[PDB]
């Protein structure tokens, strides 16, 4: 029979007031014989009605993917309201139900610290700039890097790691040409999280 998966919005979308967060209920293994799928959506047990169904998509293995999408208010999600998708279909003796919401727990402010390259790295063609982010909860977070208004794409960020005090940390490492570092270019780590002032902070870094 059909199977149901329910995905949260993306952190950035819930944190930027200029973006539109959504929750997505994906039904798979929808049969060619009963392709009709009913969706009921509930927000803290109260049924909302403004969801939209995406275009039906036939899958290379003789099944349909049927996807309902619900838009959500920034402050509702971040208030940690519970969102429920209920799926009914004829091949499904009982309606399927799934819920997600924000992870519960008092929210905690990320502490953002930048760290220049090691003297021992200065021997190399490129150097590593680290942005340590710690003491944050929940783990929902966006980290990005930039220089002179422009984004830098040559970075990698670790998945959030649960720490011994119940909060999270990660590191983001941006790799840049040594010469670019020597040239006195300011680099900046931007972090977005619900427990920051205006959901945004920025820390900078350059040769001393």
């Amino acid at each position: 029979g059909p199977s149901v998966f329910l995905f949260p919005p993306k952190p950035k979308d819930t944190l930027m007031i200029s973006r539109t967060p959504e929750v997505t209920c994906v039904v798979v293994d929808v049969s060619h014989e009963d392709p009709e799928v009913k969706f009921n959506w509930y927000v803290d047990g109260v049924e909302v009605h403004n969801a939209k169904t995406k275009p039906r998509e036939e899958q290379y293995n003789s099944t349909y993917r049927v996807v309902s999408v619900l838009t959500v208010l920034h402050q509702d999600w971040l208030n940690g309201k519970e969102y429920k998708c209920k799926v009914s279909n004829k091949a499904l003796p009982a309606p399927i139900e799934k819920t997600i919401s924000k992870a519960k727990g008092q929210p905690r402010e990320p502490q953002v610290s930048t760290l220049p390259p090691s003297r021992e790295e200065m021997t190399k063609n490129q150097v590593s700039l680290v942005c340590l982010v710690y003491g944050f909860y929940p783990s929902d977070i966006a980290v990005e890097w930039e220089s002179n208004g422009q984004p830098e794409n040559n970075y990698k960020t670790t998945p959030p790691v649960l720490d011994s005090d119940g909060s999270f940390f990660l590191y983001s490492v941006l790799t840049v040409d040594k010469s670019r570092w020597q040239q006195g270019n300011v680099f900046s780590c931007s972090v977005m999280h619900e427990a920051l002032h205006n959901h945004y902070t920025q820390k900078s870094l350059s040769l001393s």
Binding site: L15, M16, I17, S18, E144, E146, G149, P151, S190, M192, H197, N198, H199, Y200
Partner: peptide, 13 residues
């Protein structure tokens, strides 16, 4: 105050 990310509005309090 207000905060922007790459020109784009983040949040205002």
């Amino acid at each position: 105050d207000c905060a922007w990310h790459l020109g784009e509005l983040v949040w205002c309090t």
